Design a protein around this ligand. Structure first.
Ligand SMILES: NC(=O)c1ccc[n+]([C@@H]2O[C@H](COP(=O)([O-])OP(=O)(O)OC[C@H]3O[C@@H](n4cnc5c(N)ncnc54)[C@H](OP(=O)(O)O)[C@@H]3O)[C@@H](O)[C@H]2O)c1
Ligand SMILES: NC(=O)c1ccc[n+]([C@@H]2O[C@H](COP(=O)([O-])OP(=O)(O)OC[C@H]3O[C@@H](n4cnc5c(N)ncnc54)[C@H](OP(=O)(O)O)[C@@H]3O)[C@@H](O)[C@H]2O)c1
Lengths: 248, 248
């Protein structure tokens, strides 16, 4: 059971799918923090909120690093001595496909900032909360029930498995996120905070497209289930949406 | 034999070491292009130039993406229909060690820009020259003798081998460079342009430090030798300074 969880980017795709799947759980989280850039929009998320009080909507554009201090402040005020059990870095972007001969430096930097730098900086900010949760549940084994950072990655970030090429901004950012996941796993081991990169499979969202074999509920359903079964053995790993180990 | 080669960052460490090792070759390159940010400085490189006419010094700060068009112009004017056989992305930076609780967003972005974005953008700019060289030598097998991009990476970029953690900016940028190396290998295969990431081993330079087991000549000597033996089988791979396959 996850008492509290913070998930970034929940007005659309997988973020929203995860929220719903979290609710359908027999023992849903007591505090489900969800970020989105425009609360005015996210009608579906705003509607889910008006129907589920365990949902907490926080408005912020993750690119504003100075705004993090307050994000964590708002969380701590609600959770207090129980900290934050899970940070789920889901917010991500994928520019349009493009050949090396058409790659733009700005597209690379922007993708790297949102898909790589943000997750690292948010992890940094949430560390105090994650450690409090890890301590509060120190009698339990490693898992989302204690403390964990789940970085939503992608199989396209699998260098060993890249046989199609292209997608420079996206691939570099997800392979970079993976390297961050591994370092975080080593650095946070003392407090027993789990960190894993997870590929949600190819899902039919605005990013995944209509050609994807998986739908949102199917993926997120298994994801919530998978993260719920992840333990110390999978710490610092790269796993598929069903828990299968993936290649870096 | 490499008729022409472009190496970035040659006033210091490995860049300078490679230049010297290239010269000591029985059949040194006819055109050895070397970049550096301050020609006024780089006395040793400027001195090597005054003694070796095959050396060409080009001044530029790789962060200035608009300056690339001219870099390639100057090269093409010299090589012409023979193109550029090798692009050796050596320029790199490594910020001071720091724990996750002290990581700065600017340090991450800056490291990612110089160690990841620059190599990708320079590769992009040199593509026309690399393809001309690849075509001019189409009767030869893949290798530095035909056309190739060698990205100087690092074992710290090996996610599978990261058991010490930390070094977020550096690790993410080198793992990202590796993912770029793999995509470039697939995308450039048609023109048979080889791309490989190479770890020079731990060398005693300003970055490597005095604790490194290898000196500059030892590393660069084997490097020049190793790249000289790299072929299609090692294309898109991550290799040690002596050619041994490394884990992503
Ligand atoms: N779909 C797939 O097949 C697939 C496969 C592998 C990995 N993934 C990864 O899974 C995650 C979810 O992707 P998705 O399929 O749901 O894509 P999506 O439908 O495009 O959703 C991306 C989400 O991230 C948010 N976001 C983007 N930039 C942001 C920023 N600067 N600040 C705050 N939020 C930001 C978006 O907010 P706005 O609505 O405000 O833009 C949106 O909620 C991503 O990390 C993605 O890379 C997806
Ligand atoms: N030493 C090791 O043990 C080791 C191990 C693995 C990988 N490497 C990699 O090997 C390469 C060489 O590193 P090194 O040991 O020689 O380090 P170094 O002695 O610090 O040299 C770095 C070189 O890159 C240049 N450079 C940095 N930023 C630049 C920019 N924006 N534009 C143009 N040039 C720039 C530097 O120029 P300035 O003099 O103007 O600063 C310098 O010539 C790097 O890619 C590094 O990551 C080194």
């Amino acid at each position: 059971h996850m008492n509290s969880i913070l998930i970034t980017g929940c007005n659309r795709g997988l973020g929203l799918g995860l929220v719903k799947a979290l609710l359908n759980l027999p023992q849903p989280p007591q505090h489900l923090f969800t970020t989105c850039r425009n609360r005015e929009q996210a009608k579906e998320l705003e509607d889910l909120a008006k129907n589920h009080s365990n949902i907490h909507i926080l408005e912020i554009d993750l690119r504003n690093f100075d705004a993090y201090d307050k994000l964590v402040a708002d969380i701590e005020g609600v959770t207090k001595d129980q900290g934050l059990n899970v940070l789920f870095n889901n917010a991500g972007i994928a520019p349009k496909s493009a050949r090396i001969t058409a790659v733009r430096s700005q597209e690379l930097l922007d993708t790297l900032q949102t898909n790589t730098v943000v997750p690292i900086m948010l992890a940094k900010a949430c560390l105090p909360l994650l450690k409090k949760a890890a301590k509060a549940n120190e009698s339990q084994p490693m898992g989302v029930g204690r403390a964990a950072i789940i970085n939503m990655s992608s199989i396209l970030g699998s260098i060993q498995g890249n046989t199609d090429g292209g997608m420079y901004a996206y691939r570099t950012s997800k392979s970079a996120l993976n390297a961050a996941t591994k370092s975080l796993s080593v650095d946070l081991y003392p407090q027993r905070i789990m960190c894993v990169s997870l590929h949600p499979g190819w899902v039919k969202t605005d990013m995944g497209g209509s050609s994807a074999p998986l739908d949102v509920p199917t993926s997120t359903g298994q994801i919530v289930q998978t993260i719920s079964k992840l333990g110390e053995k999978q710490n610092g790993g790269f796993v598929n949406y069903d828990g299968t180990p993936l290649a870096w």
